[PDB]
Amino acid sequence: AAKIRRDDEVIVLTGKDKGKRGKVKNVLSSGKVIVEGINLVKKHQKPVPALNQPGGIVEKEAAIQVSNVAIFNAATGKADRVGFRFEDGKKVRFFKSNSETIK
Amino acid sequence: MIREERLLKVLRAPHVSEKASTAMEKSNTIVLKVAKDATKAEIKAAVQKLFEVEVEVVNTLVVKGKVKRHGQRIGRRSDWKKAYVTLKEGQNLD
Amino acid sequence: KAKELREKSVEELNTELLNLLREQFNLRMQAASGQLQQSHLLKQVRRDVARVKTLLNEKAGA
Amino acid sequence: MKRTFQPSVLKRNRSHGFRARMATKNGRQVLARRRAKGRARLTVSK
Amino acid sequence: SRVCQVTGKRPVTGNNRSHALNATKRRFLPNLHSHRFWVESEKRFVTLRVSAKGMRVIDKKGIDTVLAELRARGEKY
RNA sequence: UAAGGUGAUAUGAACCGUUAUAACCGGCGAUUUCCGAAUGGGGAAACCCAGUGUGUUUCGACACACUAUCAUUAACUGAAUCCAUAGGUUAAUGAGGCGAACCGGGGGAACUGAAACAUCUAAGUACCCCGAGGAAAAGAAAUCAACCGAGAUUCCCCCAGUAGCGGCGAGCGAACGGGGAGCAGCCCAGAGCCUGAAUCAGUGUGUGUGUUAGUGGAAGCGUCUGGAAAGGCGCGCGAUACAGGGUGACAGCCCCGUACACAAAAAUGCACAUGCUGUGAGCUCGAUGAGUAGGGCGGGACACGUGGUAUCCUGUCUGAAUAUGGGGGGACCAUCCUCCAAGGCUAAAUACUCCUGACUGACCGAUAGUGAACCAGUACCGUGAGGGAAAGGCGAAAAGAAC
RNA sequence: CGAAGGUGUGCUGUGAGGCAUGCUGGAGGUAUCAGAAGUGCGAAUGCUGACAUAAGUAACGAUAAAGCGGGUGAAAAGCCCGCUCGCCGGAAGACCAAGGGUUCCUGUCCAACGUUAAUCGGGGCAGGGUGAGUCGACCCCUAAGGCGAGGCCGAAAGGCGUAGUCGAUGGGAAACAGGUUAAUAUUCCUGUACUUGGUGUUACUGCGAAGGGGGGACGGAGAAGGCUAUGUUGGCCGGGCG
RNA sequence: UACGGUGCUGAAGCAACAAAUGCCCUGCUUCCAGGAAAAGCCUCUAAGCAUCAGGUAACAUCAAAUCGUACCCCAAACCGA
């Protein structure tokens, strides 16, 4: 019963990257997801002789709150909410708006 | 007669150090980390079975754990048993 | 692996257990040196051993 | 100057150690009290 | 412990009151006595630390009965 | 129950897993070193040393079980001493230790007050000890009452700061009676008839209903400011859900929830229903608790300090009647009334919270609130019992500052 | 489009106070009229924290004592090496017990700790290091004493104590010399030893204890005599001829 | 020669005198204040067993586990903050 999952395309409801879109890269136990290309930070990576790291200003993807994103329904062209229901003895997610199953 | 299972459990590791190396080279004596409960005879048995090598004699000693400090918090390392096992003349160990 | 190991005799089990123990020992030996670059193996082996033990107990007086 | 504390381990143990405490009712009571308090070192015993 | 075996009389506390009513704690011990009692049924003497009241009771009832009672109570004699 | 996981400071490494034996959560199991009642003996707790037996051995040794004490019962054995008894060896069953408060019993202070102090008070308090239970204790009138009657115990409000007690000081302080909470009565002292008749406990089964994981769970967009919108301004929609918490500022409609509706393979509490084991109901005839009641001497308890002092308890010495009898009705006597001691059992209303869950607060918000928001009964102090701190906050996000 | 709090300013009320507003601050505040109080601090040799003063003052812990050259280093009175000097030598040397518990050795670092500096350290961090049949403990035996089945005694708790069982500071089998590590050695290695247990043997043939006896098994002082440790001198051997 | 040391090599290695508070000495002499215990050790048998075990005899083999062992120890490491 987790409404957003690893390989879902999501749209951002709030923040600096609000309105933008991207595939969820991975979801953390803390209640945050990391989405591809969305919330970007220019970390100053400190060099280390071991592990073959040169060290520089690396622009990487910081986490974002799951609440701040929403599963995008391709049909409506909009962000939607997700509900849960049992189809053929198996739980599945569905878009609240339009009532269609997520596949 | 020591049980096979027991024997396997006895021997913890080889001990690498300058002294150990010297022992290996000159006196034909291997330096092992063994179970703290492992008696000499048991250790010997383990050596014979598990390394396939005749044992002359085993000397053991208990190494006491060092007290350390990780930041502000104090904490002691574990005690462990070292065994010098002297192999018979001509016994080459892999 | 327990469902697979349940369909065995006592003698069969014992031998398997012994083998597992041996493997574990080997791993330990390797681990201490710089040979073992697959640490999870040790974890697995112990677990397997435990399972075997459990099975044995189940068989003999349970 | 010979100061009051002149340590001796055996003496300490016999005096104050766990077994001594156990031996008597009052000792037991003391131990219980300590336990209640939450003492880490219940007795002088190392 | 100063306890009549027949009756169960223990010591009890109380006061010495003086003429000026100065209470001070005291005891009242029972009038105990170790006495060999002839038991006609078993043909042997049974020693009992007993009060004079205990003795009286025994006389009244019969030693045997007393013994039985004691046994019932779980008391050695 | 799942698409994410391999607890935390704490990353990384090596890995597992994705529609179902990854992980996570719950039931029932398995494992469960040593010390500790500690129990094979010992001991400076976490160590030292056995004995016996059953199996194995590559014959060097292994393994694993048992071996405390007391009580009780049984078996065998067995002194002085003939029989016996004491004692002895086995066997079975139970106990032991720990734990907040509450509860019953055994012991039991002093400071203090009396403007000193001794009776008195503090107080049967603090404390020590023994024992028990989820509650305990008490309990089925030898009770009150007043010539009318009530009808076991316990607890609450009155009665009443009354009547009394009291160096008649300081202080102590009822009962009768009334209003309530809750209410339940039974058995043995013993034998006859009839024979399994109510009730209770253990124990299976069945039903209901909890508990121990869970499942679903409504409805919002645009625009302005801004680092960010949940704010402003617009126009909507849900509501048996506007409890609460989070989300980059204040969100019913973003998330978790909430109302509401559902859920248990397995374990288990409580109700009734039912089987089995033990237990005996109803009827007639009786019987009706003796070193006891009373008494003397000494103490204690009763609001009641020996007083004119009834009543209860008993350390001590005595000692009835026994229902045509006996107890009580606050010295004592007479009359009347009322009850039946010297054997037991008994739910409820009452007391408490170490602990679990839920919810609440004109309670605290880091010198407060627990001693302790933080790895605190820690550091540190003390031979020891024991004492005992300080110390919270970057940011929305480490983007924790490459060069 | 900036809350509380902080800090200025201006105005205002008889006063406790109030209002407004600049800066700082970055999220809360709260009129009115009622309600409740952990409701107001300069004092209590008050309590807690912070920071002054004396003051860059006294002191830097035995009056055994230093000097120079070289080294390393960012830097050397203090560290390493060297040569002088001085101090202890029945100790200020060496080895243990007790007690401590890694302080040992090596590398590395100098914030703090070291009464100064510090490259050094008993400081920080990492790694290494403690080898036993014969040393000690454990073990067998007991002393003072402790615990103590039954037991005797005691309101309870518990006290004393028999059988027993614990308890060294005492009694009880056995190892020496040399060599070696950065750091262990009667423990490692080299040589040469010893002990008391089993087990098996062949040879013999009275063994057997919870009991009997011996032994173990013991004071102070004094006196010698015999010895060795050890030292001195000579000889010998190697080196020297200032 | 990593200036720490490592490897090889190696003469004489006697005598006299002096000499402990150490050893013989747990002795001897002496004094009164009259000087642990128990085991190990040796020995004696009892119940027992009886031509078996057990004992001593050498010889062979196996055995000796466990824990301590660094370092300070009249001190900068213990008791004195």
Side-chain angles (χ1 to χ4, degrees), chain B:
Chain B
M1 222 300 122
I2 304 82
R3 195 149 156 202
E4 290 181 298
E5 176 165 315
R6 180 43 202 279
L7 283 180
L8 290 147
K9 290 182 172 188
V10 160
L11 293 177
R12 289 293 94 182
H15 185 57
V16 316
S17 157
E18 190 193 65
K19 178 169 188 182
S21 304
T22 304
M24 245 211 267
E25 100 179 26
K26 275 188 200 191
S27 302
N28 203 344
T29 296
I30 47 173
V31 187
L32 311 155
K33 193 185 291 316
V34 305
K36 202 174 189 302
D37 93 302
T39 187
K40 268 172 184 174
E42 276 180 344
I43 283 160
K44 174 166 155 182
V47 166
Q48 278 182 350
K49 199 193 172 210
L50 273 48
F51 292 65
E52 296 122 38
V53 66
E54 287 185 309
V55 169
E56 193 166 11
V57 64
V58 179
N59 284 207
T60 55
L61 64 78
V62 176
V63 181
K64 311 305 183 283
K66 284 183 176 174
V67 171
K68 295 280 169 172
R69 293 182 62 78
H70 190 86
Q72 282 182 320
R73 215 175 272 121
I74 198 173
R76 195 151 177 288
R77 292 158 175 218
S78 285
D79 294 11
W80 63 273
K81 201 165 185 173
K82 194 170 172 171
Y84 294 92
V85 184
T86 307
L87 307 163
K88 289 190 191 176
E89 60 186 309
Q91 284 294 354
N92 198 69
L93 224 199
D94 64 320

Side-chain angles (χ1 to χ4, degrees), chain A residues 38-51:
Chain A
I38 287 184
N39 203 55
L40 288 174
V41 297
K42 301 200 271 306
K43 171 140 190 114
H44 302 90
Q45 261 278 292
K46 201 170 286 192
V48 282
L51 214 267

Side-chain angles (χ1 to χ4, degrees), chain E:
Chain E
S1 198
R2 298 174 214 284
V3 181
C4 177
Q5 284 182 246
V6 172
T7 68
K9 284 178 177 279
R10 299 182 134 284
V12 305
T13 58
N15 277 326
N16 295 303
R17 302 325 282 254
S18 73
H19 173 78
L21 280 154
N22 303 114
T24 69
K25 286 276 202 179
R26 62 160 292 172
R27 303 171 92 222
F28 283 91
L29 303 174
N31 187 7
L32 267 37
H33 287 297
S34 183
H35 188 261
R36 300 208 326 291
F37 286 96
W38 178 242
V39 188
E40 191 175 302
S41 72
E42 301 185 59
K43 278 99 177 200
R44 79 189 219 292
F45 285 101
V46 160
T47 13
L48 288 163
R49 176 133 177 252
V50 62
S51 69
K53 189 136 224 159
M55 259 169 142
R56 289 234 306 165
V57 159
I58 279 169
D59 290 355
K60 189 168 194 185
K61 295 185 172 178
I63 191 62
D64 294 290
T65 309
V66 169
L67 285 168
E69 278 178 41
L70 285 217
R71 283 205 288 287
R73 207 196 293 168
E75 186 170 15
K76 292 192 175 186
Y77 69 77

Side-chain angles (χ1 to χ4, degrees), chain A residues 6-69:
Chain A
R6 200 185 182 291
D7 60 78
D8 299 329
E9 187 166 42
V10 289
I11 197 184
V12 189
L13 311 180
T14 64
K16 78 185 162 169
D17 303 281
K18 151 181 164 194
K20 295 182 199 175
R21 49 173 38 213
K23 193 192 206 69
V24 168
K25 214 192 199 186
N26 58 311
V27 47
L28 315 184
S29 56
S30 60
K32 272 179 212 177
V33 305
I34 298 165
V35 176
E36 184 166 303
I38 287 184
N39 203 55
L40 288 174
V41 297
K42 301 200 271 306
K43 171 140 190 114
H44 302 90
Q45 261 278 292
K46 201 170 286 192
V48 282
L51 214 267
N52 304 261
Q53 290 193 324
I57 303 184
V58 180
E59 193 168 53
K60 71 184 189 176
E61 297 146 43
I64 192 170
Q65 293 276 332
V66 177
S67 147
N68 289 340
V69 319

